[PDB]
Scaffold this active site. Structure first.
Site, mmCIF file in Angstrom:
data_model
loop_
_atom_site.group_PDB
_atom_site.id
_atom_site.type_symbol
_atom_site.label_atom_id
_atom_site.label_comp_id
_atom_site.label_asym_id
_atom_site.label_seq_id
_atom_site.Cartn_x
_atom_site.Cartn_y
_atom_site.Cartn_z
ATOM 1 N N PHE A 48 35.066 35.881 40.465
ATOM 2 C CA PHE A 48 34.242 37.016 40.081
ATOM 3 C C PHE A 48 34.365 38.116 41.123
ATOM 4 O O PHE A 48 34.127 37.890 42.313
ATOM 5 C CB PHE A 48 32.771 36.607 39.922
ATOM 6 N N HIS A 69 27.425 31.446 46.125
ATOM 7 C CA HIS A 69 28.874 31.377 46.005
ATOM 8 C C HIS A 69 29.513 31.967 47.253
ATOM 9 O O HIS A 69 28.973 32.886 47.873
ATOM 10 C CB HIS A 69 29.373 32.121 44.759
ATOM 11 N N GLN A 126 33.677 38.595 36.032
ATOM 12 C CA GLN A 126 33.996 37.187 36.221
ATOM 13 C C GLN A 126 35.012 36.731 35.186
ATOM 14 O O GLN A 126 34.968 37.151 34.025
ATOM 15 C CB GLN A 126 32.734 36.326 36.126
ATOM 16 N N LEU A 133 23.376 36.835 45.209
ATOM 17 C CA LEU A 133 24.587 36.025 45.174
ATOM 18 C C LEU A 133 24.996 35.511 46.547
ATOM 19 O O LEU A 133 25.948 34.729 46.639
ATOM 20 C CB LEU A 133 25.739 36.829 44.560
ATOM 21 N N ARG A 143 33.918 37.640 31.358
ATOM 22 C CA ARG A 143 32.615 38.276 31.517
ATOM 23 C C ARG A 143 32.796 39.576 32.281
ATOM 24 O O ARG A 143 33.415 39.585 33.350
ATOM 25 C CB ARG A 143 31.632 37.355 32.247
ATOM 26 N N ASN A 193 30.837 29.853 40.060
ATOM 27 C CA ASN A 193 30.516 28.458 39.803
ATOM 28 C C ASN A 193 29.161 28.383 39.113
ATOM 29 O O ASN A 193 28.415 29.365 39.051
ATOM 30 C CB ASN A 193 30.525 27.645 41.100
ATOM 31 N N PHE A 204 27.636 45.205 37.730
ATOM 32 C CA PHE A 204 27.129 43.929 38.219
ATOM 33 C C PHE A 204 28.269 43.023 38.673
ATOM 34 O O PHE A 204 28.338 42.678 39.856
ATOM 35 C CB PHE A 204 26.277 43.247 37.147
#
Lengths: 223, 169, 33, 124, 61, 224
Positions: free
Chosen positions: B117, B130, B67, B126, B59, B106, B64
Site C-alpha cells: 500500500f 504495518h 493498496q 497506520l 483498492r 496486512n 488515503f
C-alpha cells in the site's frame, strides 16, 4: 636449502647446530668469509644478507640488483665481494666502505659461476650464455671472454693456492681446465652422464671433485 | 546501498510512467528481500517467476491509500511471500507520516504478504500496525494519478490499473 | 591474468575464461527452444 | 611467486612455445593428458618431455612426476596455469600434467629437441 | 514506401547486433545496464535474456 | 598469452557462423532483398529440373545449364584468385621475410673444418648465409677453416644441420652460444696463411678467442 633457512652443521652431530632464519625466497648460495666470522647468503629476493657467528644478526642486507642474487664471491683478502645477480649484472661491493666499486656488465644470461682470483686482481664470472668473462680489478675492464662450453656455465673456480688453472663446468656434461691465465682446455673432464652442477678444487691442487646431475661424484686424480 | 525497484503503471491500458520505489533493506531486510524476489523471480512455483509482475491495485482511496499487489486473488485477499506464507513485521521504527511510502499491507499482526500500500498522505493510525517496506524516490505523479483514479464500491477502481513491467533499478 | 578471446576478439580475465567460452557460444536456438 | 613448489616453472616467453608445441603434438596424436598417463609414459620410456601446471590443488599429486622424470632421464618443466595447459591439450577441462611421446619419423623432432634444450636450461 | 525503409532498418539493426561484442560476465553486464539506465531485470528475464537485451540496447544505441 | 579452443568448440563456432550466414540469406530472401535462389543444376541434374523444357529446346537448355555451371565456377575461381592476391604482396616480402626475431640475442656457432679446399661448399655456405640472413665470416688457414655464423635461432639450427649432415676432414662446432650484439659484418671470405694475421683480424671485432680455440683444438687433435 630452497626454503630460505640456513643450517650450520658440525663435523660430529648429524643435526644442524644453528638455524639462521630471516629469508623467505630460495637461498641460492651461502659462502663464508675468508676471515671466518661473516657468512654471505644470496637468495632470489633481489638482495644479499650478511650474518655473524658471535652476533647472529643481519649485518648488511645490501640490495641493488634488479633480479635475485644467484652467486656471491668474496676476495681473498676480504676487502671486496663480487655479488652476481640473475639479470646479467655483477656488482663488486666493498666490505669496509659499503659502496659499489665495479659493475660487471656484458653478460647475456644469468651469472651462475663467479669466483675471485687468489692473486687479488682477476675476477672470472660465468653466465648462462655459454661464455665466461675474466675481468681485471686493476685495469677495470673485461680482459678476456672464454667460450668454455656450449651450455650454461654453472661452475667457475680456480686453484686456491696460486690460481694457475681455472676449471669451467657447464651443463654440457664436460668440464674444461682452461688455465686461469692460459685459458687453455688442457684436458676435458668427460665421462659425466648428466649436467655438471658443482665442482671444486682441493687445497693442494691434486684432486678435483665435480658433482653431476647423475647423483655421482667424480674425482680427478693425476696418474 | 539500498535496493531500488521500478514498476511501470498502466491504468486503463495507458502507461502513466514508471515509479521508482527504493526499499529500505536496513530497517526492513525481509520486506526488501520479498520485493526483490517478487520483482524478477527465478523459481517460485514449479519453476515459474511468480511475483508482483502483472498484478493490479485492488483498492484506491483518494488521498488515503493505494493498496494492491495481490497476485494470488487479485482483490487484496491474496497472501504470498518468500518465507512460504505470511511473515512477521520487521520493525516499527518506520512511520507512515509522509506520502509516497510503500508499506506491507496486512489484515493484522504477522500477516504481511504480497499486498503493498502506497500512502497518499500522513496516516498516524497506520503507524505500528504495518511496517513501511520502502519509499518512492521517483514517479510520484503516477502514484498521484493512480490515487486520484475513480473508485467504485469498496474503493474498487472502475478502470484497470495494473503493472505492465516490474524489476530492479 | 588476461587472455585474448578466440571467439570475441577481446581481452578477458583469466578466471572467467572457462565460463566465457561456455556461454559465449550458447546457441541462440537453445534460448528459442 | 605464487607457488614456491613451481621450481620448473617457465616464463611467459617459454610457456607460449610450450603450449604451442603441446597443441602441435596433439594435432599429431603425440600427446597424453593427465598425471596418470604421464606416469605411464614415463614408466614405458616413451615420453621425451613432461609438462605440468603449478596450480594443482594439493600440488603433491604431480610432485612424483619430477622424481620419475629424474629416474627415467626425461626433462620436465612447470607452467603457471592448468586451464591454459588443458586448452593446449585440446581439452576443455583443466589438465595439470601432459606428456609428449616418442614417435618414429615424426616431423616435430627438431622442435622437441629445441624445447628440451630450453627446459634443461631452465633447470639449475 | 516507409514500410520497406523500416523493415530494412530492422534488418540492418539485427545484422549489426550479430557482430557486436558483449561481455559474458553477468556482473559486467549488470554494470553496463546500470550505466546505460535500463533496468537490470524485466519480467523475470534470465541472464541470457539480460545479455540479449543489452545487445539490443547497444545495437539501437 | 593466447588460448586454443578445442576441436568440439571449433565445430560449434563454425556451425554457428554457418547457421548465422544461412539465416541472413533466408531472411534476405523472405523480405525480397535478394531474388529467391534458383535450383542448382548440373548435367546429371538437367533432366530433373529442366526436363520438360529440354525436349522442346534441348540445346538452349544445355547452354543455360552450362552457363550456370560456369558462373558457379566463375565465382569460386574468382574468390580463390581474389584471396590469392594477398600472397602477391604477402609472399617473398611477408611470407618469407621473418628474420627469426633476432633483436635481444644473436646465436653464434663457430665450426672448425679440417679441409675446405672445395669452392662449391664455400659457395653453398655463402648462399645459406645470404638466404637465411645470418651474418658471420670464414677464415682460412693451413688445415684450419674457422667459420663463425651469428644469426637467429632458426638460422643457427639450420646451419648446424647443413654443415654437419648436409655437407661433408671433419667439421665440429667449437663454440655454440649467444652474444649481446653483432660483431661481424656480411658473409665474406678471407685467407690467412699465418696465425697472427688471422688473430689480428679476429681481434678487430673482439672475437680473438675463436682463433685460439681453433688452434687449441688442432693442437689437442695432433697431440693424441
Amino acid at each position: 636449502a630452497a626454503d630460505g633457512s640456513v643450517k650450520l652443521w658440525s663435523l660430529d652431530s648429524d643435526e644442524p647446530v644453528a638455524d639462521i632464519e630471516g629469508h623467505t625466497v630460495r637461498v641460492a648460495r651461502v659462502m663464508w668469509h675468508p676471515s671466518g666470522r661473516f657468512l654471505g647468503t644470496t637468495c632470489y629476493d633481489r638482495s644479499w644478507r650478511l650474518w655473524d657467528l658471535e652476533a647472529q644478526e643481519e649485518i648488511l642486507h645490501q640490495e641493488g640488483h634488479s633480479m635475485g642474487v644467484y652467486d656471491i664471491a668474496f676476495h681473498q683478502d676480504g676487502s671486496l665481494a663480487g655479488t652476481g645477480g640473475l639479470d646479467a649484472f655483477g656488482r663488486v661491493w666493498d666490505l669496509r666502505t659499503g659502496r659499489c666499486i665495479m659493475f660487471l656488465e656484458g653478460h647475456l644470461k644469468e651469472i651462475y659461476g663467479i669466483n675471485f682470483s687468489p692473486n687479488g686482481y682477476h675476477i672470472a664470472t660465468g653466465s648462462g650464455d655459454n661464455t665466461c668473462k675474466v675481468w681485471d680489478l686493476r685495469q677495470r675492464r673485461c680482459v678476456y671472454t672464454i667460450p668454455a662450453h656450449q651450455n650454461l656455465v654453472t661452475g667457475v673456480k680456480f686453484e686456491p693456492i696460486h690460481g694457475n688453472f681455472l676449471l669451467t663446468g657447464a651443463y654440457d656434461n664436460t668440464a674444461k681446465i682452461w688455465t686461469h691465465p692460459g685459458w687453455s682446455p688442457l684436458k676435458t673432464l668427460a665421462g659425466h652422464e648428466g649436467k655438471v652442477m658443482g665442482l671444486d678444487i682441493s687445497s693442494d691442487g691434486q684432486l678435483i671433485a665435480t658433482c653431476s646431475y647423475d647423483r655421482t661424484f667424480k674425482l680427478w686424480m693425476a696418474e | 546501498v539500498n535496493p531500488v525497484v521500478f514498476f511501470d503503471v498502466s491504468i486503463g491500458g495507458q502507461e502513466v510512467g514508471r515509479m521508482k520505489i527504493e526499499l529500505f533493506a536496513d530497517v526492513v531486510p525481509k520486506t526488501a528481500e520479498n520485493f526483490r524476489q517478487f520483482c524478477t523471480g527465478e523459481f517460485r512455483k514449479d519453476g515459474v517467476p511468480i511475483g508482483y509482475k502483472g498484478s493490479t491495485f485492488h483498492r484506491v482511496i483518494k488521498d488515503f491509500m493505494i493498496q494492491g499487489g495481490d497476485f494470488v486473488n487479485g482483490d487484496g485477499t491474496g497472501v504470498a511471500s518468500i518465507y512460504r506464507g505470511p511473515f512477521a513485521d520487521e520493525n516499527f521504527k518506520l512511520r507512515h507520516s509522509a506520502p509516497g511510502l510503500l508499506s506491507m499491507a496486512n489484515s493484522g499482526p504477522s500477516t504481511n504478504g504480497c499486498q503493498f500500500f502506497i500512502t497518499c498522505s500522513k496516516c498516524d493510525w497506520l503507524d505500528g500496525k504495518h511496517v513501511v517496506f520502502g519509499k518512492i524516490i521517483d514517479g510520484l505523479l503516477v502514484m498521484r494519478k493512480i490515487e486520484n483514479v475513480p473508485t467504485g464500491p469498496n474503493n474498487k477502481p472502475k478502470l484497470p490499473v495494473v503493472i505492465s513491467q516490474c524489476g530492479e533499478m | 591474468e588476461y587472455l585474448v578471446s578466440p571467439i570475441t576478439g577481446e581481452k578477458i580475465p583469466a578466471s572467467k575464461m572457462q565460463e566465457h567460452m561456455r556461454i559465449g557460444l550458447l546457441d541462440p536456438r537453445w534460448l528459442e527452444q | 611467486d605464487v607457488n614456491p613448489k613451481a621450481y620448473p616453472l617457465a616464463d611467459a616467453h617459454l610457456t607460449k612455445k610450450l603450449l604451442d608445441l603441446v597443441q602441435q603434438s596433439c594435432n599429431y596424436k603425440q600427446l597424453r593428458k593427465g598425471a596418470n598417463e604421464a606416469t605411464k609414459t614415463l614408466n614405458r620410456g616413451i615420453s621425451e618431455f613432461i609438462v605440468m601446471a603449478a596450480d594443482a590443488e594439493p600440488l603433491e599429486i604431480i610432485l612424483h612426476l619430477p622424481l620419475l622424470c629424474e629416474d627415467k632421464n626425461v626433462p620436465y618443466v612447470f607452467v603457471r596455469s592448468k586451464q591454459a595447459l588443458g586448452r593446449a591439450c585440446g581439452v576443455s577441462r583443466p589438465v595439470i600434467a601432459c606428456s609428449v611421446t616418442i614417435k618414429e619419423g615424426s616431423q616435430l623432432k627438431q622442435q622437441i629437441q629445441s624445447i628440451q634444450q630450453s627446459i634443461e636450461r631452465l633447470l639449475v | 514506401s516507409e514500410r520497406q525503409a523500416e523493415v530494412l532498418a530492422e534488418f540492418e539493426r539485427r545484422k549489426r547486433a550479430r557482430q557486436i561484442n558483449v561481455s559474458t560476465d553477468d556482473s559486467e553486464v549488470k554494470a553496463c545496464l546500470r550505466a546505460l539506465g535500463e533496468p537490470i531485470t524485466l519480467f523475470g528475464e534470465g541472464p541470457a535474456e539480460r545479455r540479449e537485451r543489452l545487445r539490443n540496447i547497444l545495437s539501437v544505441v | 598469452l593466447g588460448v586454443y579452443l578445442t576441436k568440439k568448440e571449433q565445430k560449434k563456432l563454425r556451425r554457428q557462423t554457418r547457421r548465422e550466414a544461412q539465416k541472413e540469406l533466408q531472411e534476405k530472401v523472405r523480405l525480397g532483398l535478394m531474388p529467391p535462389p534458383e535450383p542448382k543444376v548440373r548435367i546429371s541434374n538437367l533432366m530433373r529440373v529442366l526436363g520438360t523444357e529440354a525436349v522442346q529446346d534441348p540445346t538452349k537448355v544445355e547452354a543455360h545449364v552450362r552457363a550456370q555451371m560456369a558462373k558457379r565456377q566463375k565465382a569460386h575461381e574468382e574468390a580463390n584468385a581474389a584471396r590469392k592476391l594477398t600472397a602477391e604482396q604477402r609472399k617473398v616480402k611477408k611470407i618469407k621475410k621473418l628474420k627469426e626475431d633476432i633483436s635481444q640475442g644473436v646465436h653464434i656457432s663457430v665450426y672448425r673444418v679440417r679441409n675446405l679446399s672445395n669452392p662449391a661448399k664455400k659457395f653453398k655456405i655463402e648462399a645459406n648465409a645470404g638466404q637465411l640472413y645470418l651474418t658471420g665470416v670464414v677464415v682460412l688457414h693451413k688445415d684450419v677453416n674457422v667459420v663463425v655464423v651469428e644469426g637467429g635461432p632458426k638460422a643457427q639450427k639450420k646451419f648446424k644441420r647443413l654443415m654437419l649432415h648436409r655437407i661433408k676432414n671433419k667439421c665440429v662446432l667449437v663454440w655454440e652460444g649467444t652474444a649481446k650484439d653483432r660483431s661481424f659484418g656480411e658473409m665474406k671470405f678471407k685467407q690467412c696463411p699465418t696465425e697472427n694475421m688471422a688473430r689480428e683480424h679476429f681481434k678487430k671485432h673482439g672475437a680473438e678467442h675463436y682463433w685460439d680455440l681453433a688452434l687449441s683444438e688442432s693442437v689437442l687433435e695432433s697431440t693424441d
